[PDB]
Design a protein around this ligand. Structure first.
Ligand SMILES: [Cu+2]
Ligand SMILES: [Cu+2]
Ligand SMILES: [Cu+2]
Ligand code: NA
Length: 439
């Protein structure tokens, strides 16, 4: 096959993407070993769905797992009556998701299970895939002529040819695996044919963070989770928390091999130690550095000029309310709270009004990083930890280090009941989720 593995793409046809996926245990070859994973479409990752604004999506999910499941269309601003976090598809049953892609939308999104209490093992076992919304901006020459690749970053651990089970410490920290894969492959080689690469990046891991850096090169950020920036932003490294997406341009500077690495990063994961009295909790400290892939630059590379503008960010109405959400932890219980409460699917936590703008102040009073996600309503990050954000773009996940406050601008779009939660999905399963009702 091609030196660089990427998931199969399914494209809409005549404005319609109509597909039947099955969620099923699947024998496959992965990282040089035979394993049984849970997959959509028979592959890991699942197929990449590629659509345009205003296309109709008709996706019938058949559940061939021994447990109930459902789909979350992560990042898409569609109705919570379609992207329904309370829906359960029993084993052997099917459900069809049908929606129109919003007109003012572009970027990389993804789909994965969202059935409260079962997300972490189902996501860890391989149930995820990407969705790309192609834009008219892809036709400007500085992007059209770049070589485009999707990179799904997902780690895994195998025990007896199956995904390793969760331990108690996994429920507290979030499970990380020792196989750190790109598109399901272990350290693939990307042989570039053009000097400018456009890389869509997706962190589909349960809990692992990727502090991304390409040897000898900066990255040019052009899209965040849910849309383009206003103009490219040069960065020396890019931290991708669970659930986050980015699109970056790489401008290859000379011939050679360059490693794309996940540099050491300390997210506050905890271990246990016994030195006399105790046992007591002790920080795991920073992650070990990982090589994600090998990037081979072509001969005599002469990258294109960067685009000078991308997409103007909309002028939002003045906000009508300020909310304050506080995140806290009980690590030894592996219990996680928002404003002192655990999730309850019958309780509405916040009531807002559609087509108004709200300011959400989300405060991490724990010691771990927590990546906060809101369904249905993408947001603009104004500041995090008191530092103003360096760009304007739609996001739907924002990472908060211990102690930090993020200030968001949240336009409320579709009416209905939806959720917000930590995207360390073990923490959501263990209660760090609440209910927003928009009317
Ligand atoms: Cu998600
Ligand atoms: Cu969390
Ligand atoms: Cu969710
Ligand atoms: Na299948």
């Amino acid at each position: 096959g091609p030196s660089f593995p990427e998931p199969k793409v399914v494209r809409s046809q005549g404005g319609l993407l109509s597909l039947k996926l099955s969620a099923t245990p699947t024998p496959l070859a992965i990282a040089g070993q035979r394993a049984t994973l849970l997959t959509y479409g028979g592959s890991f990752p699942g197929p990449t769905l590629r659509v345009r604004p205003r296309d109709t999506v008709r996706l019938t999910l058949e559940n061939r797992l021994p447990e109930p499941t459902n789909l979350h269309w992560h990042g898409l601003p569609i109705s919570p009556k379609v992207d329904d976090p309370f829906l359960e598809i029993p084993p052997g049953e099917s459900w069809t998701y049908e929606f129109t892609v919003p007109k003012e939308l572009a970027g990389t999104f993804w789909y994965h299970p969202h059935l409260h209490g079962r997300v972490a093992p189902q996501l860890f076992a391989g149930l995820l895939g990407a969705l790309v919304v192609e834009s008219s901006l892809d036709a400007i020459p500085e992007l059209r002529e770049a070589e485009e690749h999707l990179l799904v970053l997902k780690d895994l651990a195998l025990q007896g040819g199956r995904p390793a089970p969760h331990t108690p410490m996994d429920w507290m920290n979030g499970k990380e695996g020792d196989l750190v894969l790109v598109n399901g492959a272990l350290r693939p080689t990307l042989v570039a044919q053009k000097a400018t690469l456009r890389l869509r990046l997706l962190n589909a891991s349960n809990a692992r963070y990727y502090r991304l850096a390409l040897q000898d090169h900066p990255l040019y950020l052009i899209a965040a989770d849910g849309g383009f920036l206003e103009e490219p932003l040069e960065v020396s490294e890019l931290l991708l928390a669970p659930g986050e997406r980015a699109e970056v341009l790489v401008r290859l500077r000379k011939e050679g091999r360059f490693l794309l690495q996940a540099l050491p990063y300390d997210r506050g994961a905890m271990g246990m130690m016994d030195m006399g009295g105790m046992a007591h909790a002790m920080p795991q400290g920073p992650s070990r550095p990982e090589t994600l892939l090998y990037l081979i630059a072509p001969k005599n590379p002469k990258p294109l000029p960067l685009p000078k503008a991308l997409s103007p960010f909309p002028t939002l109405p003045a906000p009508v309310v300020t909310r304050r959400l506080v995140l806290t932890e009980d690590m030894m219980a592996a219990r996680f709270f928002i404003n002192g409460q655990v999730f309850d699917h019958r309780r509405v936590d916040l009531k807002g009004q559609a087509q108004t703008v709200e300011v959400w102040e989300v405060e991490n009073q724990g010691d771990m990083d927590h990546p906060f996600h809101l369904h249905v309503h993408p947001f603009q990050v104004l500041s995090v930890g008191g530092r103003p954000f360096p760009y304007r773009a739609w996001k739907d996940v924002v990472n908060l280090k211990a102690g930090e406050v993020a200030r968001l601008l949240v336009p409320l779009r579709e009416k209905g009941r939806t959720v917000f939660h930590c995207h360390i999905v073990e923490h959501e399963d263990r209660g760090m989720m609440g209910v927003l009702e928009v009317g």
